[PDB]
Amino acid sequence: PTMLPECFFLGADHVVKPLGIKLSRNIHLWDPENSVLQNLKDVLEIDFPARAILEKSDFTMDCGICYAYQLDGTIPDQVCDNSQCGQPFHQICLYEWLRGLLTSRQSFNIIFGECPYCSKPITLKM
Amino acid sequence: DYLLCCIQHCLAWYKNTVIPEAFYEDLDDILESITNRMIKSELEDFELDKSADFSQSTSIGIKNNISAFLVMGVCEVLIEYNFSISSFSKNRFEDILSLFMCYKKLSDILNEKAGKAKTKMANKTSDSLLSMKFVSSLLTALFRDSIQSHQESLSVLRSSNEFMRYAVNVALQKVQQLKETGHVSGPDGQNPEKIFQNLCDLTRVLLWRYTSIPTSVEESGKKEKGKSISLLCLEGLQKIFSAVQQFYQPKIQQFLRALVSVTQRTAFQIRQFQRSLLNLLSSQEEDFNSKEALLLVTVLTSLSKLLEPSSPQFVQMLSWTSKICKENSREDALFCKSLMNLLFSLHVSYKSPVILLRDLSQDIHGHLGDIDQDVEVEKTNHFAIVNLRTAAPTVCLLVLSQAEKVLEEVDWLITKLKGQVPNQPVEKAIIMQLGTLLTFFHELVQTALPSGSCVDTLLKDLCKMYTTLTALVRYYLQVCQSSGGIPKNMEKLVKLSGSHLTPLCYSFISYVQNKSTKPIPNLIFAIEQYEKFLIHLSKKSKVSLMQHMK
Amino acid sequence: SVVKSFKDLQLLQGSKFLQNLVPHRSYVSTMILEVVKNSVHSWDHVTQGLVELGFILMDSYGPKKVLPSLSRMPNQHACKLGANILLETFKIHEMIRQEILEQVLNRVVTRASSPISHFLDLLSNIVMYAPLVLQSCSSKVTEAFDYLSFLPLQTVQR
Amino acid sequence: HDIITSLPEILGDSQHADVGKELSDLLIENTSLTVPILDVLSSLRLDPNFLLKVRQLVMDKLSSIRLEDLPVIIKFILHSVTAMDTLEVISELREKLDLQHCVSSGQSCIILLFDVIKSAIRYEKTISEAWIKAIENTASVSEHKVFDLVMLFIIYSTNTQTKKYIDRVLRNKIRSGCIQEQ
């Protein structure tokens, strides 16, 4: 357990990048004598929120297409790469949305399109 | 050998690190017994030099050679151990001296045994096992250290000759190893920063020994004048600087902070090195150790790579070098060759050399004379480093090769101008260059060269000259419909090539052919193509360029 | 074009006469690298060509002559262009990983006859930069471990 | 299973051949212990001649191995190729394998199989060229099996020097009335 777990990052591609970069560069400083949190904190060089307010902080955390949380196990996880929208979605809702539109083009496991709310370039990897 | 080296490094680490119990003393007393008995051991314990003559015919000779190298390595490791034990005990240094005397005896035996056969084996020039950490220490202790607690006991080692040349040989072997692989042999020869640190410290040591104690202190013998320690340290310096430019280019500042930008540091270092070269030369030695002078100019070429061609110190370098080219005669081919190489390399990153090529060609034309043995020309005033034995076999080749480089550059320009159709100044600079090369060839073709490489290279370069003229007149055939007319400067260029060059070209063809395969047919092919395309150009340019031709 | 680029640049830099005359045009090397930065976003169709290109550079101008100006600098820089490319891409295009990686390894394992120094150097840079991205492409390593028995010694340690 | 794998640390460098022999004698006897035997025997010191015999000895019994192991055996078979024996052993293999009998259970193991092949041909060139010849040269029999397509595809998918060669072969195959819908 103390050994490094498989970990990766959801959210804004412009926000996620410095976390992956900083992890990659400092990961050698990971040490399996400490705890997972006590390692992660000096590895990723950031802190966590301890129950900021976990039921309602200040965000309509619903899908903003389906306007629900908990569609069939799935969580709002796919977000915009934008400061002004930051609107979460579901994989399913945002997929069905982008697969409709004429602008969208599909590479191998990726679809690029326009965020419904702000019409900025948003990526979905199935 | 290698086992003991590892052991003693491990135990030194165990002392320095592990203690800050009753185990290491075992190994200590084992080593001390080996020391004391290996002192009073000599060569008939291992039945060496006497019973088997190490022959590379028999098995037993192989046994004795392998054994001797094992012994030599053991000797060295206990040298390291005995040094590592104490703070500079006299008795242990006597033991080290005795060990070294054993080792050096074995070395002079093996040298005889590689004197019977050739030195095809790289087994006596095999690695020492001493850490580079160690060798840095050893040379610091020998030269720089003057602490009286150590001085009394080190003064016996200082009193050596053979020992001191051995010490610098070791460092040189580490350096050669570092050049050829990525890294050196012994312990911590795999972390680059540690190797770098030892590099910097070696560099400081050899600089100090060269600068403080001069070379003109040879009070050993007239056999040691090609083997002076003041020579070996500078040789090391050279290899270090090459190696560190090659491997550790992104650390030269922290490399130099051992010895503010690169310019002032390098300028101050150059001044001292070049003063050293001046005093060696200005000594006016008739014996003339050319080895030290060659190495000095070599190191100056190596160092001059870190002066920017825009710096005033760069121009100071170039002026100084040209001054050396203008003063000091120094009758040895390799000095002139290395120096001219330096001069050109510095010069061209400041300006085109075709003036200097012409002036050097003028010097060439002075000393040799002419084909007709009735042109008395001497222009020795220009450059002092031009002699009967230097400029005739040697300088011609370099000055013509540089001219070839000039022709390649202007060829690239001609190519770009043909492809292009930014117009006028390009061709103006091109024709300026080509005019000066044409005067250059006017001086070269007049000379009487020896029948070696000189004549065929001169003919080949004149073929390149006609090819360049062909490309030029081809570009003028290309361009002359759009603009309409020829610039006056092209008319002057083609006038000078018709009038000056081609007649003496013919005379030189006659001179080379009379004195007794492909280049001369190639030359006449080039000249006839030039005439044909010039006919084409003179018709299609509305300018009569055949009245200047004959 | 890239060879020509480098021949040009070498000739220029050795030579002030040309530096006076010619205005410093960007070199194709630089353009490609800049392509790669712009590439980052959404340019899968360019990157998949990039990789092929770079490996063509490496394959062609890996060393051979030990088994000088002309053979070294516009070959060394070609190969290490390859490498620069593929590293820069491997930072940012997270779906052409395991295909750089697998292609590297493909040139690692079997050859051992052509000098392959550059490939391990590349691989070292690649991995050091983010090893966490190879616990997403891990199987590709463990099948070269089955060939680790058969490899010359300098290769294996390095 | 445990004691066998521990064999090579125990025995000296002398009494190997008879063990090899005795083990080969067990190998024809029992199929359950193909893998560990082959593991050991690749590790012990044998005559090349004995190896070749064991190669043929395993390959006749190739149908008989329970699925799980089949992969690792081929690993053995395909490390144990010279340049020169390539085409006989390949032809035999190409003949003897089925893909018909085997079939989550079947498919996973097959996938691993094809991985092993993919690996093999990636990491050693000659297997590729020989292998296609072993389909091209067996133009005769109309009865070609699931395998041959799959393998041609795979090799097209990997090393690309061969693509033209595959294309020509596939045309000659189609016009010839070998290769067809079903």
Ligand SMILES: [Zn+2]
């Ligand atoms: Zn939803």
Ligand SMILES: [Zn+2]
């Ligand atoms: Zn948005």
